[PDB]
Amino acid sequence: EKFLVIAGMNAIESEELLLKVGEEIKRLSEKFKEVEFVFKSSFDKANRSSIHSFRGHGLEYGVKALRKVKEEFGLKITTDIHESWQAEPVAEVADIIQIPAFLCRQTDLLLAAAKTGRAVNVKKGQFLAPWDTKNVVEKLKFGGAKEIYLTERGTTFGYNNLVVDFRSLPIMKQWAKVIYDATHSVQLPGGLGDKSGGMREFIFPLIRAAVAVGCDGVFMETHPEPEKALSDAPTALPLSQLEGIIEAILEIREVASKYYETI
Amino acid sequence: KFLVIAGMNAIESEELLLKVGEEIKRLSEKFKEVEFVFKSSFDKANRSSIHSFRGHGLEYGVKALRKVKEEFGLKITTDIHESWQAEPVAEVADIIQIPAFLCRQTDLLLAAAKTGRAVNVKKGQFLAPWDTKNVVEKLKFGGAKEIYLTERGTTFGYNNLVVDFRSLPIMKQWAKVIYDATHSVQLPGGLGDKSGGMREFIFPLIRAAVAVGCDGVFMETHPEPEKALSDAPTALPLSQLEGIIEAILEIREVASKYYETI
Amino acid sequence: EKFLVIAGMNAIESEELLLKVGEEIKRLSEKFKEVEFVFKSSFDKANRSSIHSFRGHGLEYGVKALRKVKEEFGLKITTDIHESWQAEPVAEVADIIQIPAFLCRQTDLLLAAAKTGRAVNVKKGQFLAPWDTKNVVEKLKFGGAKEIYLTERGTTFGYNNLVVDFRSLPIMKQWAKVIYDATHSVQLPGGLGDKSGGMREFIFPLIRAAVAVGCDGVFMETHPEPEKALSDAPTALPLSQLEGIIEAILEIREVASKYYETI
Amino acid sequence: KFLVIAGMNAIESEELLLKVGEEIKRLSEKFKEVEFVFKSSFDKANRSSIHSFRGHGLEYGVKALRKVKEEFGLKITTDIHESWQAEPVAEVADIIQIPAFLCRQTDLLLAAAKTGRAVNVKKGQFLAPWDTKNVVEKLKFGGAKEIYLTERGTTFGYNNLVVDFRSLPIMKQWAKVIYDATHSVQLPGGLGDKSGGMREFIFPLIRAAVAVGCDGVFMETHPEPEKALSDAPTALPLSQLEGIIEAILEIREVASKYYETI
Ligand SMILES: O=P(O)(O)OC[C@@H](O)[C@@H](O)[C@H](O)CO
Ligand SMILES: O=P(O)(O)OC[C@@H](O)[C@@H](O)[C@H](O)CO
Ligand SMILES: O=P(O)(O)OC[C@@H](O)[C@@H](O)[C@H](O)CO
Ligand SMILES: O=P(O)(O)OC[C@@H](O)[C@@H](O)[C@H](O)CO
């Protein structure tokens, strides 16, 4: 099946920066034709640790910025919602509606996304066991979702740290397509006090493990200059490095794929 | 004075809420040394299964809570799940409760703060004790004056929660601390389509909470927990509430002498 | 039943310092007559993180130092063993033989302690679940142990951190007397790089929880001047504070005891 | 070259050890690109239950290992539990293995180092990746020259282990890293009187190990795991060893291009 690569910018800092990333993703989509690319960005960071951190420029502005990316580059779009009412307006531009990790248990948010007819991708809560995502998928199907994804983004391991339990990939594959969030799986929640920390040095190694184990796609956040990111500065991947990473995981996927177990 | 938040997990019917409110009222008259606050949810917006009990809606719930408040003169507290619910709930709730999974949703916290009511935030199972300082700051920013932080367990491996009592002293630095004796022993998604829990540890850990030092306790009860529509494994039998309260007041009286300063 | 208070110095730095602590413990035993005191110290720290850290002055010297404490103060003695052969020589002076946390699963070490006829106290490994200590007690009984204790000293919670799951007290009480190690439960394993860290500020609060929940005794490490300790410097309790802590837990134990659940 | 440590958890009989050694020898002849080391324990000194299988003693075990080495010319590795065992074991073992629970026992490490043999330390389930730097230093101090650090899971809640693959890159800074594909999926004391495990995850995680980058893999096998006297839930069927080895060599070949420098 066609490997999915969700990539973009964690937050919509400016429509201009968004298009810069979109142009690169567009270029990569032309090269890696065997990959289905979906552009990602959030119109709002509704769960920053601090009240003083960047959130965004509003749903209206965000949707406008995303629609511009879809129109100018012909790229599929994905963004996350935080409250039920946002599902309808977002569904107009988003091909895949993302459900934040902390909200993976909020029945109404899930139902609101499902009735739009759009694909739904749920970030697995850091408090959730792999086998407990089965009920998450059941809620979505109940609400009309036909295309469902579950994203592995790490699990609470002690304080301010996350661990990736790769056993979750084959477990979750039993009821939905699985995506590996290579970015947030290495973040250190609240690690920097008023902001979360992260270890970029482990992004690549862990993504290699992800494709070796076997998944249906990867999620990666990028930025032209991570150091200047308004969110995920510690984990944003330099845009120039995206191509090399994708090539690498496609190669590892190919050689490992014959050994992928059948569910 | 010491705060005791009690009631039942969900509003299964105003008839049941009234039965429980009656007992809480009685206890309230028996323990003048305690400030009781009646709690119940008008909606279980985060059940594991789509087929589990959620409630009768916001309308029915707010009405039931009003009845409890008018029929027993008891303060009220209930949780909200989306920003728009803060205003209508504030009309009856003396304390707006923020769910654990939602402790980081800025707009929810701000909506609660804006109502002018007191706010009690359940500490996320994914949150470190010191990470609550920022939660408090958001509320102060939103104009909140009476802020509570509730300890309800931390993720410990899968389908299990552990109570790290070092959190009480730590959180007390920036807010009043409440100990949720009910959910701290629950086993997240333990029964598959529902969460589990071990009631035998409720009392022991509640004693630890007051020995350590907290500003209040949170307890969910039910006439017949066997028939509870939520928190069935952890709901405390109504008849046992009095004994436990008297117990923690006695322990608190002796232990309070050693509570470290802020 | 008579509450047990195991106290002393983590390591036998010098026979002189040992006697200084013993004198204070002796004084407290005279005051708190309802408490059974047992003097503790290790003739060897066989598991320091670094090869450069203090270990001790040998089994021979240690036993001699301990025997001096027992003779001069008439105090019961307890010390830990690391290899099977040490059980015999140690049993000559130790009333209770302690089994290190990392070694709680070493069958031979446990058996060696049990056949001496002495009481045995096993520190619950940081990797052990409360209910898995049942097999630990079974091994000891099999080996002849008639007086067995299980000590709660924290559980691995993420890296370099330990959490105390007080549910372990009533669970473990089902098969053995339970002791709460107020000292090591707040240590940060490997926290200081070549040495473990710790948070002394939580020692008192956690010990209060221990007696409120209900245990059969407490274990506390002390030192005239913690800052100068050769081991457990971050968690050693000032000797002058020992009396106040004991008085406090006896008071909390009394008021809470009527509520202790029956196993 | 790539290291593959294989054999069976316990020496149930030299007859069985020889059957397994034969297969390992065959594979050794098939994969010249790999260095095979035969492993087996002469004693399970840490079983959960007093009634579980330990072995036939140090004497019987060392003799059985000698037979394997002489009859197949395969290098040997076995674990020690007390300091006195290092010398007699060193006579046959090319690599002395240090158990996970004992990774902090200074005298055990020193005794192993003193024999002059290579030493492989199982990373304690209670140890942080960076905490192994000190383990290595003790061995260097004791004169150890060939030092290995093995990843075998970390405590994650109760009766469960999680493999944090960030440990491979971290540990590689101070030693060669081996991935124990067998015990990393075991469930400590999961069956009550015995430990559990999930064999379905052995292969998937072994693939992750080589995709990330390690100097070797550790695998326990058994003709009929159903009849194994230890590691029954995790022992890999002997017939499946070849397929998995070929698989990790292929993945390693492609992935090695991206292994970060030390
Ligand atoms: O406010 P901080 O803690 O930096 O949070 C960063 C997060 O918002 C980021 O990891 C992500 O968008 C999570 O929700
Ligand atoms: O997993 P289930 O059983 O649906 O449980 C959800 C409950 O524990 C819920 O009431 C709890 O208060 C969640 O916040
Ligand atoms: O070498 P470090 O890591 O400081 O170890 C201190 C320990 O020996 C101490 O916590 C205790 O004696 C544990 O075994
Ligand atoms: O808990 P039980 O089943 O006795 O298991 C012990 C085994 O897993 C043992 O062989 C393992 O290698 C311990 O180190």
- To which H or E segment does residue B111 belong? helix B106-114
Mutate to test the pocket of ligand 1, among A99, A223, A232, A237 (most ligand atoms within 8 A of CB): A232
Rg (CA), chain C: 17
CA distance A30 to D59: 66
Q: What is the DSSP letter of C5?
A: E
* Neighbour subunits, D (≥3 Cβ pairs < 8 A): A, B, C
Q: Nearest CA to A122 among A179, A47, A201, A37?
A: A179
Q: Is the CB of C184 under 6 A from ligand 3?
A: yes
User: Please, which residues have CB within 8 angstroms of residue B35's CB and are 6 or more apart in sequence?
Assistant: B1, B2, B3, B4, B75
Q: Nearest CA to B173 among B119, B135, B205?
A: B135
Mutate to test the pocket of ligand 1, among A47, A79, A102 (most ligand atoms within 8 A of CB): A47
* Neighbour subunits, B (≥3 Cβ pairs < 8 A): A, C, D
Experimental determination approach used: X-ray
Cβ(A20)–Cβ(A238) below 8 Å: no
B39-77 core/surface letters (b: 16 or more CB in 10 A; e: else) = bbbbbbbbbbbbebebbbebeebbebbebbbeebebbbb
Cβ–Cβ contact D66 with C under 8 A? no
Number of residues in chain C: 263
CA distance D5 to C260: 52
Rounded-to-10 torsion of CA D67, D71, D72, D78: 0
Is the Cβ pair B165, C170 closer than 8 Å?
A: no
Ligand closest to Cα of C196 equals 3
Write C60-67 long-range contacts (CB < 8 A, 24+): C61/C12, C61/C15, C62/C12, C63/C89, C63/C90, C63/C92, C63/C93, C64/C15, C65/C12, C65/C15, C65/C18, C65/C41, C66/C12, C66/C18, C66/C39, C66/C41, C66/C93, C66/C94, C67/C92, C67/C93
User: Please, which residues have CB within 8 angstroms of residue B208's CB and are 6 or more apart in sequence?
Assistant: B163, B165, C166, C208, C209, C210, C212, C213
| Residue B44 bears catalytic tag | yes
Ligand closest to Cα of D101 equals 4
- To which H or E segment does residue B35 belong? strand B34-41
Is the Cβ pair D204, A164 closer than 8 Å?
A: no
Q: Which two tokens stand for residue C41?
A: 């110290």
Give the experimental resolution in Å. Answer: 2.0
CA distance B253 to B261: 16
User: Please, which residues have CB within 8 angstroms of residue B226's CB and are 6 or more apart in sequence?
Assistant: B232
For residue C261, give the 3-state DSSP assignment. coil
CA distance A23 to A26: 5
Which positions of A are annotated as active-site residues?
10, 45, 232
User: Please, which residues have CB within 8 angstroms of residue B19's CB and are 6 or more apart in sequence?
Assistant: B223, B238
Write A197-201 long-range contacts (CB < 8 A, 24+): A197/A160, A197/A234, A198/A232, A198/A234, A198/A235, A199/A234, A199/A235, A199/D166, A200/A226, A200/A234, A200/A235, A200/A237, A201/D169, A201/D260
Residue ranges making up the domain that contains B250: 1-262
Q: What is the DSSP letter of C260?
A: P
Please, what is the angle between helix C59-73 and helix C15-31, to 10°?
30
For residue D181, give the 3-state DSSP assignment. coil
CA distance A174 to A164: 18
Q: Nearest CA to C47 among A37, D138, B39, D118?
A: D138
- To which H or E segment does residue C97 belong? strand C96-99
CA distance B26 to C26: 51
Rounded to 5 degrees, what angle do the CA atoms D244, D2, D119 make? 110
User: Please, which residues have CB within 8 angstroms of residue D242's CB and are 6 or more apart in sequence?
Assistant: D27, D30
User: Residue B33 to residues A53, A78, B28, B209, D167: CA-CA distances in angstroms?
Assistant: 42, 55, 9, 18, 54
Domain CATH code at residue C198: 3.20.20.70
3-state secondary structure C228-251: HCCCCCCCCEEHHHHHHHHHHHHH
CA distance B102 to C213: 31
Q: Is the CB of C40 under 6 A from ligand 3?
A: no
Q: Is B111 exposed, middle or buried (0-12, 13-18, 19+ CB in 10 A)?
A: buried
CA distance C168 to B200: 12
Residue type, B126: F
Q: Nearest CA to A215 among A184, A163, A191, A250?
A: A250
- DSSP letter string, C187-241: EETTTTSSS-EE-GGGHHHHHHHHHHH--SEEEEEEES-GGG-SS-TTTPEEGGG
Q: Nearest CA to C113 among C95, C87, C142, C77?
A: C87
Strand B34-41 relative to strand C197-198, pairing: unpaired
Look at chain C and report how many structural domains it folds into.
1
Give me the sign of the Cα torsion angle B16, B18, B24, B27. Answer: negative
Q: What is the DSSP letter of D148?
A: E
Q: What share of chain D is helix, strand, coil (3-state, %, to 5)?
A: 40, 20, 35
User: Please, which residues have CB within 8 angstroms of residue A258's CB and are 6 or more apart in sequence?
Assistant: none
Strand B2-10 relative to strand B34-41, pairing: parallel
- To which H or E segment does residue D245 belong? helix D241-255
CA distance C138 to D47: 12
Question: Cβ–Cβ contacts within 10 Å for residue A225, how many?
Answer: 11
Give me the sign of the Cα torsion angle D156, D161, D162, D167. Answer: positive
3-state secondary structure chain A: CCEEEEEEEEECCCHHHHHHHHHHHHHHHHHCCCEEEEEEEECCCCCCCCCCCCCCCCHHHHHHHHHHHHHHHCCEEEEECCCHHHHHHHHCCCCEEEECHHHCCCHHHHHHHHCCCCEEEEECCCCCCHHHHHHHHHHHHHCCCCCEEEEECCEECCCCCEECCCCHHHHHCCCCEEEEECCHHHEECCCCCCCCEECHHHHHHHHHHHHHHCCCEEEEEEECCHHHCCCCCCCCEEHHHHHHHHHHHHHHHHHHHCCCCCC
Task: For C6, list phi and psi in degrees, rounded to 5.
Answer: -95, 120
Task: For B121, list phi and psi in degrees, rounded to 5.
Answer: -100, 125
Cβ(C107)–Cβ(C84) below 8 Å: no
Query: Facing residues of D148 across strands?
Result: D120, D176
Nearest residue (by CA) to ligand 3, atom 1, is C48
- To which H or E segment does residue B29 belong? helix B14-30
CA distance A247 to D257: 12
Query: Facing residues of A78 across strands?
Result: A40, A96
Q: Nearest CA to C209 among B211, B181, B216?
A: B211
User: Please, which residues have CB within 8 angstroms of residue C2's CB and are 6 or more apart in sequence?
Assistant: C34, C35, C36
Is the Cβ pair A169, D247 closer than 8 Å?
A: no
Nearest residue (by CA) to ligand 3, atom 9, is C232
- To which H or E segment does residue C120 belong? strand C119-123
Q: Nearest CA to C123 among C166, C184, C202?
A: C184
A26-65 core/surface letters (b: 16 or more CB in 10 A; e: else) = bebbeebeebebbbbbbbbbbbbbbbebebbbebeebbeb
Residue type, A7: A
Task: For A74, list phi and psi in degrees, rounded to 5.
Answer: 65, 35
Query: Facing residues of B76 across strands?
Result: B38
For residue D24, give the 3-state DSSP assignment. helix
Rounded to 5 degrees, what angle do the CA atoms C230, C235, B248 make? 160
CA distance C200 to C236: 8
For residue C40, give the 3-state DSSP assignment. strand
Cβ–Cβ contact D128 with A under 8 A? no
Question: Cβ–Cβ contacts within 10 Å for residue A171, how many?
Answer: 22
- Work out the minimum CA distance from B257 to partner chain A, whole angstroms: 31
Rg (CA), chain D: 17
Give the residue carrying structure tokens 């091909």. A95
User: Please, which residues have CB within 8 angstroms of residue D74's CB and are 6 or more apart in sequence?
Assistant: D21, D24, D25, D28, D36, D37, D38, D68
- To which H or E segment does residue B62 belong? helix B58-72
Cβ(B158)–Cβ(D157) below 8 Å: yes
Question: Cβ–Cβ contacts within 10 Å for residue D50, how many?
Answer: 18
Ligand closest to Cα of C11 equals 3
Q: Is the CB of C79 under 6 A from ligand 3?
A: no
Q: Is A215 exposed, middle or buried (0-12, 13-18, 19+ CB in 10 A)?
A: buried
Question: Cβ–Cβ contacts within 10 Å for residue C32, how many?
Answer: 16
CA distance D39 to D65: 9
Cβ(D215)–Cβ(A212) below 8 Å: no
Q: Which two tokens stand for residue D139?
A: 């061995």
Residue type, A122: V
User: Residue C109 to residues B259, C92, C116, D82, D196: CA-CA distances in angstroms?
Assistant: 41, 17, 12, 10, 24
- Give the number of the atom of ligand 4 that is nearest the alpha carbon of residue D44: 10
Strand D154-155 relative to strand D161-162, pairing: antiparallel
How big is the A-D interface in CB pairs under 8 Å?
A: 92
Q: What is the DSSP letter of D217?
A: E
Cβ–Cβ contact B45 with A under 8 A? yes
Distance of CA D37 to the CA centre of its chain: 10
User: Please, which residues have CB within 8 angstroms of residue B84's CB and are 6 or more apart in sequence?
Assistant: B111
* DSSP E strands, chain D: 2-10, 34-41, 75-79, 95-98, 118-122, 147-151, 154-155, 161-162, 176-180, 186-187, 196-197, 216-222, 236-237
Nearest residue (by CA) to ligand 2, atom 13, is B46
| Residue C135 bears catalytic tag | no
- To which H or E segment does residue B87 belong? helix B86-90
CA distance C252 to C254: 5
Alpha helices in chain C (DSSP H): 15-31, 59-73, 87-91, 107-114, 134-142, 168-172, 203-213, 242-257
User: Please, which residues have CB within 8 angstroms of residue A78's CB and are 6 or more apart in sequence?
Assistant: A6, A8, A38, A39, A40, A94, A95, A96, A97, A98, A121
User: Residue D59 to residues A187, B9, D41: CA-CA distances in angstroms?
Assistant: 51, 63, 12
For residue B65, give the 3-state DSSP assignment. helix
- Work out the minimum CA distance from A160 to partner chain B, whole angstroms: 7
CA distance D198 to D188: 11
| Nearest Cα residue in chain B from A159 | B128
For residue B144, give the 3-state DSSP assignment. coil
